[PDB]
Every structure is written in C-alpha cells, then in structure tokens.
Design a protein around this motif. Structure first.
Motif, PDB file in Angstrom:
ATOM      1  N   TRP A 149       2.724 -14.598   7.104  1.00 31.72           N
ATOM      2  CA  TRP A 149       1.269 -14.776   7.064  1.00 31.72           C
ATOM      3  C   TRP A 149       0.936 -16.245   6.769  1.00 31.72           C
ATOM      4  O   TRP A 149      -0.003 -16.805   7.402  1.00 31.72           O
ATOM      5  CB  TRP A 149       0.596 -13.867   6.035  1.00 31.72           C
ATOM      6  N   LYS A 173      -3.444 -12.172   3.314  1.00 29.65           N
ATOM      7  CA  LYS A 173      -2.474 -11.108   3.633  1.00 29.65           C
ATOM      8  C   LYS A 173      -1.126 -11.443   2.996  1.00 29.65           C
ATOM      9  O   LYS A 173      -0.459 -10.559   2.443  1.00 29.65           O
ATOM     10  CB  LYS A 173      -2.359 -10.967   5.148  1.00 29.65           C
ATOM     11  N   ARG A 233       7.924 -11.131   4.878  1.00 30.68           N
ATOM     12  CA  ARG A 233       6.684 -10.955   5.596  1.00 30.68           C
ATOM     13  C   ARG A 233       5.680 -11.984   5.079  1.00 30.68           C
ATOM     14  O   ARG A 233       5.012 -12.620   5.897  1.00 30.68           O
ATOM     15  CB  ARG A 233       6.206  -9.519   5.405  1.00 30.68           C
ATOM     16  N   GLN A 289      -1.216 -10.594  -0.625  1.00 30.25           N
ATOM     17  CA  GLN A 289      -1.078  -9.153  -0.864  1.00 30.25           C
ATOM     18  C   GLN A 289       0.408  -8.773  -0.896  1.00 30.25           C
ATOM     19  O   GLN A 289       0.839  -8.030  -1.799  1.00 30.25           O
ATOM     20  CB  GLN A 289      -1.857  -8.382   0.207  1.00 30.25           C
ATOM     21  N   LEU A 327       9.146  -7.736   1.740  1.00 30.34           N
ATOM     22  CA  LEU A 327       7.782  -8.186   1.403  1.00 30.34           C
ATOM     23  C   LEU A 327       7.714  -9.701   1.412  1.00 30.34           C
ATOM     24  O   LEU A 327       6.765 -10.250   1.943  1.00 30.34           O
ATOM     25  CB  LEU A 327       7.354  -7.689   0.038  1.00 30.34           C
ATOM     26  N   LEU A 350       2.709  -7.364  -4.071  1.00 29.52           N
ATOM     27  CA  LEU A 350       3.439  -6.095  -4.074  1.00 29.52           C
ATOM     28  C   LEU A 350       4.888  -6.336  -4.464  1.00 29.52           C
ATOM     29  O   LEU A 350       5.471  -5.535  -5.207  1.00 29.52           O
ATOM     30  CB  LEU A 350       3.367  -5.431  -2.705  1.00 29.52           C
ATOM     31  N   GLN A 388       5.172  -6.619  -8.083  1.00 29.05           N
ATOM     32  CA  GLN A 388       5.086  -5.277  -8.683  1.00 29.05           C
ATOM     33  C   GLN A 388       6.435  -4.566  -8.598  1.00 29.05           C
ATOM     34  O   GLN A 388       6.750  -3.746  -9.478  1.00 29.05           O
ATOM     35  CB  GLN A 388       3.992  -4.458  -7.996  1.00 29.05           C
TER      36      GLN A 388
END
Ligand SMILES: [Zn+2]
Lengths: 142, 340
Positions: A62, A70, A58, A73, A55, A77, A80
């Motif tokens: 972005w 993005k 990535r 986001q 994550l 996550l 989390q």
C-alpha cells in the motif's frame, strides 16, 4: 511479484494468503487421513509469525502504491498479532512518524519497553530476515 | 348559486363550533335549525351534485375554506372534508354533538329524540338519519372484527389493505390541491411531513407511488417532491424493505440513478476488518453488510431495464477503486461475487 514490480497482483496475492490464514485452520488433526505434516506446518509460533509476515508484506505495498491508510490498517493488525517481533513496530512507528508522530509513537515505545524465535521453519525465518530492514534498532532508539 | 354561499359558510361555522366545548347556550331551537339546514345540504348533494358549475363552485369555496384555515395552530378542525361529505354532513354534526359533554340536557334529549324516534317511522321514502347511524355502527363493528380475526399484515405493502386506503386518501388530497392550484403540492407535503409520524408517512408514500390512476399526476407530483427533498429520501431508501423499492424504481426510472448513488455512497463508507470476515462500518448508523447486500440483490432480481443499469453502476464503481479480483480490498468486488 513485488521484486518484478507489479503492485496490483502483489496485493492480490498477499490478500489471498491472508484470507487462508484466518478463514481456515491448519491444525485440524481431527481426522488422520495420511502422512500429515507433524511439526513444521503445525507450530502456532509459525502461524503467528507468518500472519504478521504477510500483513507486513502487504502493508508496504500500500505504501509503494501510495495508499498509506490501508497500509496502516495492515501494520496495526500485525502489531495486534505479534507484539514481540519489532519488525512490525519499525514499520508502524515509521508511518506514524510520517503522518501523526508524537502521542502514538511514544505510546508504542512504551508498548515495546513493556515487551522487552523458538522453533520456526526455515523458509519463514529466511523470509523474515530477508524483508526486514537493517536500520531497525537505530530507528527503534529514535 | 349565491343563495348557497351564505348557507354553506354558515353551516361550516356552526359545524366547526359544534365540536367545541362552549356549548351552553344551545337549545332544541338551535339543533332543529342545524338539522333543517343539513337536510337542505343533503338534498342539494342529491339533486344537482354532479356535472355542473355548481359542484365546482362549491369545491372552490370548500378548498379555499380548508386552506385559509390550513390546519395549523388555532384549530385543526376537520370540517366537512370534501364535496362527498355534503351527502352525510348531518351525521357528522350529530356525532360531534354526542361527543360534546358540555351539551345541555334538554338539547341532548330533543336531539336524541330527533335521531331516534323509534320504529314509529319504519316506512320512510328518504334513507333517514336513524338508519344512517345504525348502518354506521354496523360498518364500524365489521371493521373491528376483520382486523382482529382475519386480517394479516401483508409483507408486500402495496397489496396490504390498511396502507392501500391511506394511500388513496393522500392521492385524493393531491388531486384536489392540483385542481385548486392555490398553493403548490410541495408546501402541502412539507407541512404533512412535520406534523405526523414520519416513518408511517414514508411507508404510505411508497404504496401511494404505485396505485394506478383513478381519474398519473398523483405519482408524478410525489417523484418531484422527493427529488427536491434529499433528507427524506435519505430516510426513505433507508426505512423500507428491498422488494418494495425494487418495484418503485422499475415503475419510476426517475428514481433509479439517485437511489443507486445513495447505495453507492453507503458502500464507499464501509471498511473491511480481517479478523471477522465481514465488511463493517465504523459508525453504527451506517448500513450493515447484510442490508446493503439485500437491497442490491433485490435490485438485480428485477426487469432488464434496471438490471443492466444497476450492474453497470456497480462495475464502474469497482474499476474506480482498483480492479482487484479477490476479497478484502473492494466492497464492490465482494458484492459482484456475492451475486454469482
Ligand atoms: Zn510442514
């Protein structure tokens, strides 16, 4: 691909990794079919740290391409998933400090101070140590 | 010709007040006068009711009557709706008088005696009033029995049987306004849209858009009304099923590009969540993944004049949002994949 500078195929490959981690389970020791991997490729700590890793890996792409929503986001996550990694928080708080600093930043400080390695495989440890930035705690004390 | 104006307007006034609960002064004299006038009209419709200036003159008088009243506020009185109802005006009046509770007893008795003398007059040259009312009760019972013992709500609404009668009523009401040319259809449609239940109206419209002509001016007017009014078309393409809209669009190419814009806009306002492998919307009234997949699948399983159009409209929206080839990034990639 990131190090060779190809944003598109990078986000592609990260996404494919992310798919495999959530739309499949590795610990399916229901049917003993072989010499399966007993330990290295089963550890839940390895799974959650790797999820968070991909994550983050990535989210920064972005940012590099200029798609910060993005990116946000993906970092959310990751927070989390592994709230005791702090690599996540550096990137999250850097983004919120860029866009909408105050309330959310302090709200996540409080999450960190609420929070405040066991047996990872070595390829994952070295990947995390590699991507992480040196100025983390300095920023985490800001 | 002029002799008939004062007859017809007078009859329409008497008829309209018939249904109203002021009936105290009425008597056998009034009712007899009513029914003799109604006999004259029923005779006229028979004699020289087809193919002349008289038919069109009467239509002009009637439709002008129905538009000066309009059907708003002071009374939504039907009146005799159209030239064909002249041929059974007398029945309407009678039915209304049987509904008026305020009718006096001696009037009611004389009335019912004039409708129902008995089988004393079984031999009659003209199909008389008693036979007409019996034959009406027959049809009504027949309709009820089919509904509750045979009828089934067809899914392909175009081929169902209730909707297809409503449709042809609406179509007759557009043709009459077109020939009248007094006020524009858009006004009629707008007024309709406020008064009556909207979702029902919309279902109806869909099916009316497909009925072949009965003289395509009917459909041709509605396409224009709809492209004028976006909000309804917003709720139109939102309410109906897939296959119906697919048949609609192949029929009317004028509806294709806007409908795709509507779908394309619903795609662009979804977001993917990684934890459940499903596109979702933020807001609840944003069409879910499943419905949007349905509609596109219906659109793609269609004649080729539309298949290339929708397919190209999708590819151009994929390439517009980064040409990824893997799911989780572009709703348009996930659609093009969930098609093969
Ligand atoms: Zn292993």
């Amino acid at each position: 691909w990131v190090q060779l500078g190809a944003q598109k195929v990078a986000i592609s490959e990260f996404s494919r990794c992310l798919e495999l981690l959530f739309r499949a389970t590795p610990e399916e020791k229901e049917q003993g079919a072989a010499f399966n991997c007993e330990q290295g490729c089963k550890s839940d700590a390895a799974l959650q740290q790797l999820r968070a890793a991909a994550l983050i890996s990535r989210g920064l792409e972005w940012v590099a391409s200029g798609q910060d929503t993005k990116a946000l986001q993906d970092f959310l996550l990751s927070v989390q998933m592994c709230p005791g990694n702090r690599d996540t928080y550096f990137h999250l708080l850097q983004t919120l400090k860029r866009l909408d600093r105050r309330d959310e930043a302090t709200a996540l400080w409080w999450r960190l101070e609420a929070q405040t390695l066991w047996s990872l495989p070595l390829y994952l440890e070295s990947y995390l140590s590699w991507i992480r930035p040196s100025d983390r705690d300095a920023f985490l004390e800001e | 010709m002029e002799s008939l104006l004062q007859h017809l307007d007078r009859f329409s006034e008497l008829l309209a007040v018939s249904s109203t609960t002021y009936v105290s002064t009425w008597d056998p004299a009034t009712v007899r006068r009513a029914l003799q006038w109604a006999r004259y009209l029923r005779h006229i419709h028979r004699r020289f009711g087809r193919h002349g200036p008289i038919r069109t003159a009467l239509e002009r008088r009637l439709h002008n009557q129905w538009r000066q009243e309009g059907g708003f506020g002071r009374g939504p009185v039907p009146g005799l709706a159209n030239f064909q109802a002249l041929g059974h005006c007398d029945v309407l009046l009678s039915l209304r008088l049987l509904e008026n509770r305020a009718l006096g007893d001696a009037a009611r008795y004389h009335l019912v005696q004039q409708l129902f003398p008995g089988p004393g007059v079984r031999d009659a040259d003209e199909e008389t009033l008693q036979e007409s009312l019996a034959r009406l009760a027959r049809r009504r019972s027949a309709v009820h029995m089919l509904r509750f013992n045979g009828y089934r709500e067809n899914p392909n609404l175009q081929e169902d049987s209730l909707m297809k009668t409503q449709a042809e009523l609406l179509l007759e009401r557009l043709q009459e306004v077109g020939k009248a040319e007094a006020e524009r259809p858009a006004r009629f449609l707008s007024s309709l849209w406020e008064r009556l239940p909207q979702n029902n109206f919309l279902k109806v419209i869909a099916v009316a858009l497909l009925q072949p002509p009965l003289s395509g001016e009917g459909s041709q007017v509605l396409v224009h009304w709809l492209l004028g009014n976006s909000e309804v078309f917003a709720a139109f393409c939102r309410a109906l099923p897939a296959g119906l809209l697919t048949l609609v669009t192949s029929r009317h190419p004028a509806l294709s590009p806007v409908y795709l814009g509507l779908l394309t806009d619903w795609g662009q306002r979804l977001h993917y969540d990684l934890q459940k492998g499903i596109w979702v919307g933020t807001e609840s009234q944003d069409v879910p993944w499943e419905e949007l997949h349905n509609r596109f699948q219906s659109l793609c399983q269609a004649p080729p004049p539309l298949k290339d159009k929708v397919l190209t409209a999708l590819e151009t929206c994929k390439a517009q949002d980064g040409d990824f080839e893997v799911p989780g990034l572009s709703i348009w990639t996930d659609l093009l994949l969930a098609l093969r």
